[PDB]
UniProtKB/Swiss-Prot annotation, chain E:
Function: Component of the PAF1 complex (PAF1C) which has multiple functions during transcription by RNA polymerase II and is implicated in regulation of development and maintenance of embryonic stem cell pluripotency. PAF1C associates with RNA polymerase II through interaction with POLR2A CTD non-phosphorylated and 'Ser-2'- and 'Ser-5'-phosphorylated forms and is involved in transcriptional elongation, acting both independently and synergistically with TCEA1 and in cooperation with the DSIF complex and HTATSF1. PAF1C is required for transcription of Hox and Wnt target genes.
Localization in the cell: Nucleus speckle
Parent-record interval covered: 853 to 892 of 1173
Record's subunit section: Component of the PAF1 complex, which consists of CDC73, PAF1, LEO1, CTR9, RTF1 and SKIC8. The PAF1 complex interacts with PHF5A. Interacts with KMT2A/MLL1. Interacts with STAT3. Interacts with SETD5. Interacts with ERCC6. (Microbial infection) The PAF1 complex interacts with Zika virus French Polynesia 10087PF/2013 non-structural protein 5/NS5. The interaction with viral NS5 proteins may reduce the antiviral immune response by inhibiting the recruitment of the PAF1 complex to interferon-stimulated genes, thus preventing their transcription.
Tissue spec: Widely expressed.
Protein name per the record: RNA polymerase-associated protein CTR9 homolog
Length: 209, 78, 248, 270, 40
């Protein structure tokens, strides 16, 4: 197709913006809710060998409070990206002081490449997303409550009021879709605000692991 | 800084009364006047109403601490 | 068919109940008032998310959910401007205090803004507009016990200052403690665990319903508040209670 | 749950239903007759159509009409999927959408005889003309109760249940469905708590599991307190994955061997 | 009424904070678009 790929490209980019806005980064309220028309007018409305070609709708956004903390959101054109393809993505992240990134593959990357994501891990955090999972914002679903990632100062205050070792909280595993939305890593507590029908609201905490 | 509930839960009342009545039946000196009865559970219940059971309750907390509460300190429920 | 299904039912459900009890037998309510298991991993932070046992809750109705934005106002609002209507409800030496005093009038207006905010909360908690809720104290039977105990006569004008209601409910919301503590983390959760009961309490013990509808005297109102808290404090889950064995 | 204007009219909700149900060629096809017609202009049949378009064996495939329309398909898309699925090793010569018979013609071009049979069976069972897989069939209901009716606070504060069209499938994908347009990606639930877990999360499985558990309990009118369902759905989802209530869910928990030997297996764990 | 006017002007202050944040994001996008360009 040509029209359907523009629709999908725009929906993916919108969900990426709502992600980078929830992860804490800085996105303008215009880029947050732009509509499909000015997405057509902005790039080319022609992905079938045209102007909104991928690796041109990529985005850089800097963190909200630390203006040196940036994150790329790349868009590979290889449906099945390889090691030789993320090697170059990481090769030109090194020209900057950017560490975080985000790869939106078209089909799964190769298991040969996923190691290069953990081998480069402590020095350059990057993560993948299939473009299929990004077609919707799952934090909008009505079953998914609200997730708030707690800061290290307040995890200690939580473990200290309940006198509770971090080993005794409920868990959420790192590959959870909502844990990968917020990009929490292991050993990081998530606050969850649930509407309760017997009490009205319930706040529960889950340790990533 | 005792933080537990100030009410005698219903499990503590069962165990305090059973234990106090065992101690009374083994000839322990009663803390209350007997208006003329002889069953040890009726006596232990009378003593509980007079808040004169000489027992304290050590409430372990899950981290390992504990709090002792005299029986005359907490509010008897039934 | 009924005789066949009875004989397969008996043996197929008796195994569900056994798998459930083995999976949940050691979950219980600690003196921490938190719900943990044998490894002391915390399962729920309060029993049932509100900290109350099930033998004492009842079925009530939320009044401020689903009237409409005008029926809510002409029922939970307490105008202090109509002078004729207040001599019908309040006695003569209270209708000047609410008709002149701007402190009392700011207080009464602020209370209605609080009810109006609780209303939006409720509409995000119970969408689909489902008024029936389960909650500890039966307030409307307590009000009715109060009218029969102090002989209310809802035909005479009452002597209950509309502000004694406003401030007595503020002082009662304090004595219903579920999460004890002065910590911010603990005040937040005490505020959450008693959020639906506090909304119900503030929506049936209004200043306006207590004067146009229940007609409680002052003495009956003190009895009523002592009764509400004494029942709430009986509803709290006892520590030691084996709740996973009940759930199974 | 349908999103926009599709939620009201049964006409614009019906093509959603078509865009979700699995249609292969076998549902639209009627008769498959391979032939050894050598000279493509010779056409052992009565068809003047090839003679306007211009290997010796074909697959005359005559389609169905009341099955081709009730899913609203044209021969251009079948012809396009028919070469996109097999590439340029074939040359479909479709009819027009004026004739009475809906005939396709395939020919190979580049153990040769059986090959049109070999590809006419892989193309017949599965060619997925239109829809997503695992969805076998999709009903279409208008809700009668207030349980699936849309509820909407009006502009005066009343609640006001709206009556919209909803779908109701038979297989499960849930990720390819939420992404479809004119499909509410907010209220499209799934009845399948292992589907929800890999899509939505572990905190969504807890809400879904309790809604399932409460549906199967209150179906017959009875009522179980809520405390007891929250606690079961909390122990099942407390360690971050779905812990079944079987010997593989609760014995893998680290409770200590004297407690696991009491449930099952009794010596294998000792 | 005066309190209503002060709350409205404060909402205008938050609008202006939005204006400065938007100019800020646009201001760094010109520096950054250079990095999406030189990246490829």
């Amino acid at each position: 197709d040509d029209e359907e790929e523009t629709y999908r490209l725009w929906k993916i980019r919108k969900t990426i913006m709502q992600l980078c806005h929830d992860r804490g980064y800085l996105v303008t309220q215009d880029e947050l809710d732009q509509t499909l028309e000015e997405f057509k007018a902005q790039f080319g409305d022609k992905p079938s060998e045209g102007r909104p070609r991928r690796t041109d709708l990529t985005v850089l956004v800097a963190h909200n409070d630390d203006p040196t903390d940036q994150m790329f959101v790349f868009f590979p054109e290889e449906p099945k990206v390889g090691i030789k393809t993320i090697k170059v993505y990481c090769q030109r992240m090194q020209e900057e002081n950017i560490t975080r990134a985000l790869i939106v593959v078209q089909q799964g990357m190769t298991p040969s490449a996923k190691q290069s994501l953990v081998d480069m891990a402590p020095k350059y955090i990057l993560e993948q997303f299939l473009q299929q999972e990004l077609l919707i914002n799952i934090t909008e679903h009505e079953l998914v409550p609200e997730h708030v990632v707690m800061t290290k100062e307040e995890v200690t205050e939580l473990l200290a009021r309940y006198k509770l070792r971090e080993n005794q909280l409920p868990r959420i595993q790192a590959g959870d879709p909502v844990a990968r939305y917020f990009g929490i890593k292991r050993g990081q507590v998530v606050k969850i605000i649930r509407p309760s029908e017997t009490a009205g609201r319930y706040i529960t905490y889950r340790l990533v692991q | 800084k005792r933080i537990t509930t100030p009410y005698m839960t219903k499990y503590e009342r069962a165990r305090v009364l059973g234990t106090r009545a065992l101690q009374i039946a083994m000839c322990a000196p009663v803390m209350v006047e007997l208006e003329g009865e002889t069953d040890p559970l009726l006596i232990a219940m009378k003593e509980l109403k007079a808040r004169k059971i000489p027992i304290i309750i050590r409430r372990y907390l899950p981290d390992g601490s504990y709090e002792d509460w005299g029986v005359d300190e907490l509010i008897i429920s039934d | 068919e009924g005789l066949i299904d009875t004989a397969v039912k008996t043996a197929e459900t008796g195994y569900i109940q056994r798998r459930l009890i083995k999976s949940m037998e050691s979950v219980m309510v600690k003196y921490d008032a938190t719900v943990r298991n044998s490894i002391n991993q915390v399962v729920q932070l309060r029993y049932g998310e509100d900290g109350l046992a099930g033998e004492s809750v009842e079925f009530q109705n939320l009044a401020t959910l689903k009237p409409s934005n005008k029926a809510f106002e002409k029922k939970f609002r307490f105008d202090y401007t109509n002078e004729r209507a207040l001599r019908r409800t309040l006695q003569e030496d209270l209708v000047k205090d609410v008709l002149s005093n701007a402190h009392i009038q700011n207080e009464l207006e602020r209370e209605f803004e609080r009810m109006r905010e609780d209303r939006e909360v409720l509409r995000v908690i119970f969408p689909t507009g489902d008024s029936k809720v389960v909650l500890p104290c039966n307030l409307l039977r307590m009000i009715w016990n109060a009218q029969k105990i102090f002989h209310i006569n809802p035909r005479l004008p009452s002597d209950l200052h509309p502000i004694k209601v406003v401030e007595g409910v503020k002082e009662l919301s304090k004595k219903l403690v579920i999460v004890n503590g002065d910590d911010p983390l603990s005040r937040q959760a005490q505020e959450n665990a008693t959020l639906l009961f506090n909304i119900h309490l503030r929506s049936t013990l209004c200043s306006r319903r207590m004067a146009e509808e229940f007609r409680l005297s002052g003495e009956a109102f003190d009895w009523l508040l002592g009764e509400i808290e004494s029942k709430f404090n009986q509803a709290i889950a006892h520590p030691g209670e084996m709740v996973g064995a009940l759930a199974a | 749950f349908l999103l926009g204007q599709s939620a009201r009219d049964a006409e614009r909700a019906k093509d959603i239903l078509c865009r979700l149900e699995h249609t292969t060629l076998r549902k639209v096809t009627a008769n498959t007759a391979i032939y050894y017609d050598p000279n493509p202009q010779s056409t052992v049949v009565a068809e003047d159509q090839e003679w306007v378009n211009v290997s010796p064996w074909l697959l005359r495939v005559e389609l169905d009409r009341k099955h081709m329309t009730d899913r609203k398909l044209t021969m251009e898309q079948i012809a396009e999927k028919i070469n996109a699925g097999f590439g340029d090793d074939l040359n479909c010569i479709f009819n027009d959408d004026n004739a009475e018979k809906l005939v396709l013609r395939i020919r190979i071009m580049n153990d040769d005889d059986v090959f049109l049979r070999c590809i006419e069976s892989n193309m017949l069972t599965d060619m997925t003309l239109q829809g997503i897989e695992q969805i076998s069939k999709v009903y279409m209901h208008l809700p009668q109760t207030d349980n699936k009716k849309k509820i909407i606070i009006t502009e005066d504060g009343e609640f006001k249940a709206l009556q919209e069209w909803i779908l109701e499938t038979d297989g499960v994908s849930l990720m390819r469905v939420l992404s479809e347009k004119d499909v509410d990606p907010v209220r499209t639930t799934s009845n399948d708590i292992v589907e929800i877990f890999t899509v939505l999360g572990i905190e969504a499985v807890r809400k879904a599991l309790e809604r399932e558990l409460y549906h199967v309990i209150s179906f017959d009118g009875s009522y179980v307190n809520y405390r007891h369902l929250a606690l079961l759905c909390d122990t099942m989802t407390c360690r971050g994955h779905l812990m079944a209530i079987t010997r593989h869910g609760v014995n893998r928990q680290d409770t200590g061997p004297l407690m696991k030997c009491s449930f099952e297996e009794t010596v294998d764990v000792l | 009424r005066q309190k209503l006017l002060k709350e409205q002007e404060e909402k205008r202050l938050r609008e202006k904070e939005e204006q400065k944040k938007l100019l800020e994001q646009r201001a760094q996008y010109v520096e950054k678009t250079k990095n999406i360009l030189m990246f490829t």
